[PDB]
Amino acid sequence: GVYFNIDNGFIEGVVRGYRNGLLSNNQYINLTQCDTLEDLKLQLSSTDYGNFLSSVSSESLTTSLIQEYASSKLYHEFNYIRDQSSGSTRKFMDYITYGYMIDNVALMITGTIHDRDKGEILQRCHPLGWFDTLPTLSVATDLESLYETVLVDTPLAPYFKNCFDTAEELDDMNIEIIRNKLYKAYLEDFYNFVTEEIPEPAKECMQTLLGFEADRRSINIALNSLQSSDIDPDLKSDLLPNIGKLYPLATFHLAQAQDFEGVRAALANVYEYRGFLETGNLEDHFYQLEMELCRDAFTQQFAISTVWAWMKSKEQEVRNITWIAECIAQNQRERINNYISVY
Amino acid sequence: AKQKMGRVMQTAAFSLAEVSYATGENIGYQVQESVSTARFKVRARQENVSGVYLSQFESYIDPEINDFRLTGLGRGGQQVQRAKEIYSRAVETLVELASLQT
Amino acid sequence: AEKRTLIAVIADEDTTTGLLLAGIGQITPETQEKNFFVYQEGKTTKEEITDKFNHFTEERDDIAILLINQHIAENIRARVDSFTNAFPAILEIPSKDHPYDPEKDSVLKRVRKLF
């Protein structure tokens, strides 16, 4: 591949430069010792992120404020990176944004099934997943009104067309099912879009990483299977994204599995996920493998997949920042090193 | 029990924080108005301590367990269990306070 | 009295409600009112908190515990006023989002005074 410079060479270069300002392992360790909130803020100011720590007063300076500043930096950098690009890179960024927009639309669903004064949701909606019709859905009250505000003038319409008949949700949890249903539809759309419009090596990288994410969603669903009276295994197969690496040998068997014994046994059919179902923790190892995959995709250095790599790598970095800030400011030193810093 | 409501309550709060980190966002908005009666209740107090009918609340878990569980990632159940343990600590502290008043 | 469930309303931090409703919570489906009213984390005046406290601890007949965030060190006088009896609401002051269980807690203040 050589054509990539013609359309996203500048975008790739600036995204790589943004990657180079990640959390230095020594710097992160030094910040970890600086358990004091002010000391941690000073250390983070010493980090490449800049003078964000001095933007807010030390009085309100907390782990929540630190994560808010990190989210603001994420949103602004991602806004610049998508605004400076066009074409295939523009659509890729659009999709990335839709990933969080699914969750933001799910939050917008809250307040429709039960009146909830959507102003707080609008003020609290995740910025990276901003939707153009989000205020339009905010005004809509009835289920059909919100559905029209989402099936029309909102880009997520194909997902709400592949499922969500009348969007009643009288016996289907939004976050547990409806959010997972739209998430699965998004995962399928992403996978086929990568397979049909993204060149290699980014094509193969995107296929592998999307399979990883779909497998993560399937594993979470399987873990949540045993704690629900609803979500029958007939629905669980529907609940799965119907795509990914484990599909179909491990995905179908896990979906048919209902007892806890099926859960772990199913992950053993695949070599990559061996041990996650039998040791450690689901989410922590999920983030570990995701960061490793992001580094692997960033190694290619001349692919569209590098944008997704930096997205997910420094999403893991923001998760690590949350972990460290919480465990340091509020004094839980035992798992301060649970954060991943192999970037 | 007050210094437990410092330490152990911090531990349960960080259980919630780890669950949020797994979910990547504050699940508090979803948890809001999740269920009418979560899996816990306070039974009527009844006891007689040192000749006085001190009313220590013997709270017990609701039979309809996990009425608002099963949402998000796998850490939700662990956070629910940690919250139930902290709530048992809370019932103990409330019973001790009711004794310290009566 | 009868059985009931806890509530947590003190405007310092409502994240305690998020961290506790996973195991223990309270809403009134018959009354269509969430008994575990949020604290808004400082987004509401103390008048609404006082009104909710009066409704829960002086209008509700069903008796159970109640929780309060770091605002318990701010509304100590009202806490002493409503804490005259263990029922209907025996108050409590969890730490919430910051370590906020000093000697300034009203129950701890009474314990120290009688200590």
Side-chain angles (χ1 to χ4, degrees), chain A residues 1-4 9-14 16-23 27 40 47 49-50 52 61 63 67 70 74 76 78 81-82 87 90-92 95-96 98-100 102-104 106 109 111-113 118-119 126-130 135 140 144 147 155 157-160 164 167 179-181 183 185-186 189-193 198-199 201-202 209 211-216 219 222 233 236 238 241 244 247-248 250 252-253 255 257-258 262 265-266 268-271 273 275-276 280 282-283 285-289 296-297 300-304 307-312 314-316 323 325 327 329-338, chain B residues 1-6 10-14 17 22 24 28-29 38 40 44 51 60 63 72 74 76-77 83 90 98, chain C residues 1 8 11 18 22-23 25 29 42 64 73 78 86 88-89 94 99 102:
Chain A
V2 304
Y3 269 88
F4 172 77
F10 163 83
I11 308 294
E12 190 276 331
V14 65
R16 276 296 92 193
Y18 289 167
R19 182 266 176 193
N20 296 115
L22 61 83
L23 294 174
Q27 184 34 269
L40 173 59
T47 300
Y49 280 82
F52 64 110
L61 188 153
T63 175
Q67 205 75 5
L74 182 63
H76 298 353
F78 182 87
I81 199 64
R82 45 181 171 51
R90 184 41 201 171
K91 314 322 311 303
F92 203 80
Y95 270 112
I96 295 323
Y98 292 165
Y100 308 92
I102 301 299
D103 188 41
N104 272 323
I109 297 169
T112 77
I113 193 66
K118 304 282 221 323
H126 193 316
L128 282 72
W130 169 251
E144 291 325 329
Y147 180 62
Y159 317 117
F160 292 165
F164 312 107
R179 169 194 159 171
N180 283 7
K181 194 53 51 203
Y183 193 71
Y186 177 75
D189 174 327
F190 213 81
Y191 204 110
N192 83 0
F193 182 76
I198 301 299
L209 61 84
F212 284 171
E213 301 305 357
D215 291 331
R216 274 191 51 270
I219 296 161
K236 183 151 292 282
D238 164 86
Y247 197 82
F252 182 16
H253 171 48
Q258 188 274 331
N269 315 130
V270 65
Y271 200 88
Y273 303 130
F276 292 166
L282 284 85
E283 41 275 29
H285 291 175
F286 286 151
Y287 290 132
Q288 203 44 20
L289 189 46
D296 183 30
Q300 193 34 30
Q301 182 58 266
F302 184 80
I304 282 287
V307 179
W308 185 96
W310 150 79
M311 280 288 103
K312 294 302 141 73
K314 182 265 289 181
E315 181 96 20
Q316 161 54 40
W323 273 90
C327 292
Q330 313 294 60
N331 294 17
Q332 295 297 109
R333 280 306 195 74
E334 190 277 331
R335 54 221 181 290
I336 192 66
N337 278 59
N338 217 338
Chain B
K2 157 260 189 181
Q3 58 76 38
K4 293 322 171 43
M5 291 265 147
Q10 273 314 90
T11 62
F14 273 19
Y29 306 130
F40 182 76
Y60 68 98

